[PDB]
C-alpha cells in the first residue's frame, strides 16, 4: 500500500488473492473521578455501535 | 452545531429585542426604532434624522441583507480560511501516514 | 505643551529558501540516490518556508 505495508498475498497452494488487515481498531477513553474518591471507572468506545 | 446555532439565535434575538442592555446586566426592552435612534445619536447624527427618514433606512437595510444573501450563493472565495484550516489538518495527517 | 513622541515597530522579516539536495549532498549522486528514501521530509520544509 501507500505506506509499504504488505496488504495483498497470493496463496501458494490454491492460487487466490487475499487481503491482510490489522486486528486493532478504534479509540478507547476512560472516564474516572479521583483515585481517592473511588476505584470505579467508565469506558467509552468510539467507532462501535 | 445545534448548540452553536442556538447560542447565535439567542444573541440575535436579544439584540433585536433588548438592544445593548443585556450585555452589562439584565435585558431591558426597547422598541427597535428608538434603539436605532440611540445608535444614530452615538455617531453624531441627531435623533430626528432617523425618525424623519425611517422608511428609506429600513429599505436600505433590507436591500443590503438581500444583497449578502444573493452573494453568498454565488461566490466561492468567501469562507476561504476555514477551508484552509481543514485542508491543513487533513494534509498533516496524510503526511504522517505517507512518512 | 505640544509633545511629539516617536514609536518604532517591526512589520516583516527576511524571506528565505533552502535546497535540501545542495545542503545535504552537494554534487554527489550516491548521496542523492540515498536521499530518495527521505523523500517527504523536504517538501514539508519547503512548504513551511513558503
Amino acid at each position: 500500500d501507500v505506506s509499504d505495508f504488505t496488504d495483498s498475498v497470493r496463496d501458494p497452494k490454491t492460487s487466490e488473492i487475499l487481503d491482510i488487515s490489522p486486528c486493532s481498531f478504534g479509540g478507547v477513553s476512560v472516564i474516572t473521578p479521583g483515585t481517592n474518591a473511588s476505584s470505579e471507572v467508565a469506558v467509552l468506545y468510539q467507532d462501535v455501535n | 452545531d445545534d448548540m452553536i446555532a442556538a447560542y447565535t439565535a439567542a444573541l440575535v434575538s436579544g439584540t433585536a429585542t433588548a438592544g445593548w442592555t443585556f450585555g452589562a446586566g439584565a435585558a431591558l426592552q426597547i422598541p427597535f426604532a428608538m434603539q436605532m435612534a440611540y445608535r444614530f445619536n452615538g455617531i453624531g447624527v441627531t435623533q430626528n434624522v432617523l425618525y424623519e427618514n425611517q422608511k428609506q433606512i429600513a429599505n436600505q437595510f433590507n436591500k443590503a441583507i438581500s444583497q449578502i444573501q444573493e452573494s453568498l450563493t454565488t461566490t466561492s472565495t468567501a469562507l476561504g480560511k476555514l477551508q484552509d484550516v481543514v485542508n491543513q489538518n487533513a494534509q498533516a495527517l496524510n503526511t504522517l501516514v505517507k512518512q | 505643551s505640544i509633545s511629539i513622541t516617536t514609536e518604532v515597530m517591526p512589520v516583516s522579516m527576511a524571506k528565505t529558501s533552502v535546497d535540501c539536495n545542495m545542503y545535504i549532498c552537494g554534487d554527489s549522486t550516491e548521496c542523492a540516490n540515498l536521499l530518495l528514501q527521505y523523500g517527504s521530509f523536504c517538501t514539508q520544509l519547503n512548504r513551511a518556508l513558503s
Binding site: - | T21, A24, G25, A26, L28, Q29, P31, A33, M34, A37, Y38, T46, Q47, N48, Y51, E52, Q54 | -
Partner: protein
C-alpha cells in the same frame, strides 16, 4: 474591577416625539416616559423624572411624518 450594575426596573409607556403647537419636539438626552398620569423626560440609565420644558427638548419640523407622534404640552418659562 469596580463596576456599576443597574437593577429594579419597571415599564413605562414611551413615544418618539411630542407634537405641540404644530411642531415636533425631540428629547436632547433621554427618553419620554408616561407613568399613568403625566409625561416626563428621563435619563436612560436611572429613573429620575423631569418636566418637559424648552431646554430639555429641541424642535425639528412638523408633526406629520414621525410614526408614534403624540400630543402634549411644553413648559416655556415666560
Amino acid at each position: 474591577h469596580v463596576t456599576y450594575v443597574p437593577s429594579q426596573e419597571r415599564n413605562f409607556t414611551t413615544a418618539p416625539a411630542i407634537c405641540h403647537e404644530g411642531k415636533a419636539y425631540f428629547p436632547r438626552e433621554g427618553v419620554f416616559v408616561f407613568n399613568g398620569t403625566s409625561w416626563f423626560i428621563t435619563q436612560r440609565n436611572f429613573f429620575s423624572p423631569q418636566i418637559i420644558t424648552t431646554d430639555n427638548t429641541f424642535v425639528s419640523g412638523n408633526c406629520d411624518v414621525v410614526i408614534g407622534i403624540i400630543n402634549n404640552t411644553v413648559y416655556d418659562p415666560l
